[PDB]
Amino acid sequence: MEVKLHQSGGGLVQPGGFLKISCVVSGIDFSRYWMSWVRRAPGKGLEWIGEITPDSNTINYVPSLKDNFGISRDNAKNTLFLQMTKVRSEDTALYFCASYYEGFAYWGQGTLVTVSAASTKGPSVFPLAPSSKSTSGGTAALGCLVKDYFPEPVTVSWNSGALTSGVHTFPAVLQSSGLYSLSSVVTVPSSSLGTQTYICNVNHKPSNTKVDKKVEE
């Protein structure tokens, strides 16, 4: 016995497509709570999408989201549904099954919905060359820009795993393209730079693209 809001049914949809998210509630009287859907995207905060009453006899929406989202529930099965239709590229977010009573007490684990019209593309790797705009004094920053790939999973290593201290691979961001771009950087002493050779190894396995690019000053 723990309160479990288990969400499922999120993935890739094209712009103008449809999708239905399930959240099955156990550990609390699902019949007794108002159930809401709320989403979070990287650039935005929390967006309250809508709520449905315990009896399902009233559905409340935010006016700009009324038309494309549809909330339903089944007290017999203890599950809450969200139907997304004609979805926009801006609708990419993590959608959250949340209970409401005194407040937003119980939450779901999160369901990712990616709206993109792209098919599988491999990345392009451009060197982030070090300079004295990229040196501060003693230590120098360099890295790799992994740009316009699809879908998400991409692995970046440095000198085939020899360099792991002080490397930072930032989370990928979804561009207006519908393609992902990401940046990996490392900080090393600037003395090193003349002797050492620096290579970032990027692998995108949905495309089977493996790129070994060096960053030269």
Added chain:
Amino acid sequence: AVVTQESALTTSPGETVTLTCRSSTGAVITSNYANWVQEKPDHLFTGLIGRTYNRVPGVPARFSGSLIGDKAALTITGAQTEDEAIYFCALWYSNHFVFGGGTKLTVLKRTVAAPSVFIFPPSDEQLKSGTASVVCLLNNFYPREAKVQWKVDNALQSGNSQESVTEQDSKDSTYSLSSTLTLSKADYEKHKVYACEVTHQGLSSPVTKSFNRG
């Protein structure tokens, strides 16, 4: 209707901190049913306050929800480091909820850490593609809240840069951030100076990293 909160606040363990939440229509009334939700790393959400004053069952007693003047307010009496998170406030406007932008609460786990700023101009290989991306890097800063502004020929830019942050370091509480500004090869070549201005708690004056194309 617009719901507004402080973008970020800093406190230290044991102090008392108060977050505010503002109605664009005027004074927040009980009809607004102010709710307070907390966001922790890996997207973990906790309802703290509902209907202005009510504590959600299970929320610690150090969290209080109130109406102060024209705003709704969340007060943390005896702030803990575990309270370092993002706090969202929702207001009920007759038939729907409207969350605010969020407030980044920092409860000082260590000394303030300034970032080291690095700027990377676009590669010529990318320039052959026909696009140009300027990458700005901030390394090992704490607190998270920092302002990264892109200036193209001293003109503040908007709508053409996207940000990314690393997870908080488990051993020294630092964050790293990436700011990428993407432009046409055409629009890139119609300008001179690309600059990255960085304001932070740890910097007395804003740091600027600049480069000239040409």
